[PDB]
């Protein structure tokens, strides 16, 4: 399973199991460019989030309820949804994912 693999590699589940995790299959430039797009509030209230104009190719990785460290199972779900990230700093760049419209 892609999730078990990527998650494993990226050190996302090499010392704990992460419930959720979205991987974007678009160029980093394109993704970073989102920081100058539709400005909306994040779930945390703060209004420094920017929804993508278009839909990106993604992969929702969910931990199935039956798994426990050191064995983290992941349900892979491919999709094409708008992303919403929280940009901060200079250069303004994505530092938090937030949702997939």
């Amino acid at each position: 399973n892609y999730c078990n693999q990527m998650m494993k590699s990226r050190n996302l589940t090499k010392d704990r199991c992460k419930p959720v995790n979205t991987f974007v299959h678009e160029s980093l430039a394109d993704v970073q460019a989102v920081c100058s797009q539709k400005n909306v509030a994040c779930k945390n209230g703060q209004t420094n989030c920017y929804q993508s104009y278009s839909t990106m190719s993604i992969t929702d990785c969910r931990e199935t309820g039956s798994s426990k460290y050191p064995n983290c199972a992941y349900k892979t779900t491919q999709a094409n949804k708008h992303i919403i990230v929280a940009c901060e700093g200079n250069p303004y760049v994505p530092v938090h994912f937030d949702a997939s419209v």
Partner: peptide, 15 residues
Amino acid sequence: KETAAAKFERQHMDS
């Protein structure tokens, strides 16, 4: 070591 914007790239980015 690993900035906030760097950690994003590693955790989510998979161009």
